[PDB]
Amino acid sequence: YGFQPTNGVGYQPYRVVVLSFELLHAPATVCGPKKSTNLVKNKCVNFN
Amino acid sequence: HTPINLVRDLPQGFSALEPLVDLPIGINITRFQTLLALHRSYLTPGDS
């Protein structure tokens, strides 16, 4: 591909990353991040 | 891991085995084999 900075938008090289997420029965290794909150004690709270 | 003083057989006694590792390999394994090591002293020539 002849990419040159002068070219147009379509012409410009683009870095593309595709994250395929194979889903199998097997143990899941890649999980999402943890959105957590502060811990409060001595109060009736709904904890997870 | 425990220390023992007994050559002949397993010692009679009860102990638990705590889990060290859980690996996600997910491969079907039918068989296994153990590996041993050789020990050579200074006196020995290196050859096999």
In units of Å, what resolution does this entry have?
Answer: 3.5
Distance CA B48, CA B40 (A): 10
Distance of residue A26 Cα from the nearest chain B Cα, in angstroms? 6
Chain B residues in contact with A26 by the CB 8 A cut-off are 24, 26
Q: Distance (Å, rounded) from C-alpha B4 to C-alpha B10?
A: 9
- CA angle, residues B45, B46, B48, in degrees to nearest 5: 105
Contacts of A3 (CB under 8 A, 6+ apart): A11, A12, A13
Nearest-CA neighbor of A24 among B28, B20, B34, B1? B28
Residue in B2, B26, B22, B23 with CA at minimum distance from that of residue B12: B2
Question: Which tokens in the block code for residue A7?
Answer: 């070219």
Measure B45 CA to nearest chain A CA, in Å. Answer: 48
